[model samples]
Target: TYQYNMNFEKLGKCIIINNKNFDKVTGMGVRNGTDKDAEALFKCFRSLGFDVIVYNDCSCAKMQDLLKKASEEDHTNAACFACILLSHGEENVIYGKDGVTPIKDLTAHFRGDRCKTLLEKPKLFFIQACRGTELDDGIQ
Candidate 1:
């Protein structure tokens, strides 16, 4: 008999959506480090069998449209959904071409009760942005 250490099957049909653009170019444009970082991360996830989607300089409406469409589709067979947002932002907010929007609006669709099909699956959001004006200098 062959020994099996891994019992769980690998994930399939995972979505990796990257939003890398801040409005008004605050020292970082769409072609800056954010987009490059997302591209690298996307590639890493792709190696693990994920279906990646990258959106550059999207407006709030665009963001909502993408998520709504994805949620409406049948994802009963998908393993999970993952979204990454990289931009200049404030606490509980994300930037778009028009302006900043509440992060809650973007994630509401993945709520356990709201998105029944993905209730048991992992819905991950990786946000890389400034939360506040205070900066830490590593000193008490």
Candidate 2:
């Protein structure tokens, strides 16, 4: 069995973006209990040996910039990269403070061709949000 080498100098960086507050114009209300979620995730990942960093109430542009910058970093000695997002979202998109942004756009910077350092390494994302408006109706 081929296992991913996790014995690098570092377990790699983990960014937790906790968007509890949203712009009123975006039609998103403040998310309650997300702080708790963030804290728990922080402790969980940190305990797992990830270098964790947290950000709060990011705008769409800010979110994009943060990820872009992360992808730009040299990960030569790291094992992998992880990002966790807690926000209001629809299918394939999440709300920033200013508005909704496509999840793909936020992660495009880490594409194999774009982020060579992570080309063959693991790049993970954990998104906690409403993925769609559809609700499961109980059987009639």
Candidate 3:
């Protein structure tokens, strides 16, 4: 018998970081057309008992600070740490209030040598941003 519905709990904590601003643009820009869909994803994750943290348009300093503190915090009891970054970005980069910074700089805090407790845990990052300059032209 195959059961289509099953209840399962989250095995990790989630940090939802939403960037709704583009320093180069003005007046409520930068969010993707799928912002609502992203919110729905957040809700679904929350329903599974994952601790979620949501923020909007943070500077590079703030980003580094937050992750550093999170890494230092006790995650030995957590299954893992998950982060979602939404913003305008290029390859290997993400935007801050001032400008862009290497995404690796942010994730480096969770490396095995720095945060030993989470060394073996799954550290996931879901980034939604433009990775290149190529424009998609709908069927001519």
Candidate 4:
């Protein structure tokens, strides 16, 4: 149940999908600190022994492609896996470069049923997004 007592070691690789700008198709504006977030995540994960790969401003279709492609790879040699998404959001939604998408719709690609290689293995996903954290009048 316990692997370490305040000790942090390297594990495997981490795929960081960061979106800074949204396409006109999404009818959205530019993000302020998105890329800065990407750099910070890369540095932190790398320091922990994770090989980080960053992809920026991906469309909805491309987001699925990236996740599916990563899930298809061979992780038999690695300790675990990680996928990080930094983007705009509303509850249960993560915006792609071109449009909006459900977090589960993208995350389901790595499920045990879909990915046998990752079955019963440690699979981590980080979704960094923003929406009505503080609001009233049942705002969405």
TM-score of 1: 0.79
Q: Each model's TM-score? A: 0.79, 0.96, 0.80, 0.84
Better of 1 and 2 by TM-score: 2
**Model 4, position 129: C-alpha lDDT score:** 86
Worst lDDT 10-window in candidate 2: 1-10
Top-scoring candidate (lDDT): 2
Error of 1 at 22 (Å): 4.8
lDDT of 2 at 40: 99
Q: Is candidate 2 or candidate 3 better by TM-score?
A: 2
Q: Please, what is the whole-model Cα lDDT of each candidate in the order they appear? A: 0.70, 0.95, 0.76, 0.83
Model 2 score (lDDT) = 0.95
The C-alpha RMSD in Å for every predicted model, in order, reads: 4.8, 1.4, 5.2, 4.3
Candidate 4, position 13, lDDT = 68
- Candidate that beats the other on TM-score, 2 or 4, i.e. the better one: 2
Q: How close is candidate 3 to the true structure, as a TM-score?
A: 0.80
Model 2: per-residue lDDT, tens digit, 93-116? 999999999999998899999999
Which of 1 and 4 is the better model by lDDT? 4
Number of clashing pairs per prediction, in order: 0, 0, 0, 0
Candidate ranking under lDDT, highest first, comes to 2, 4, 3, 1
- Between which residue pairs do clashes occur in model 2? none
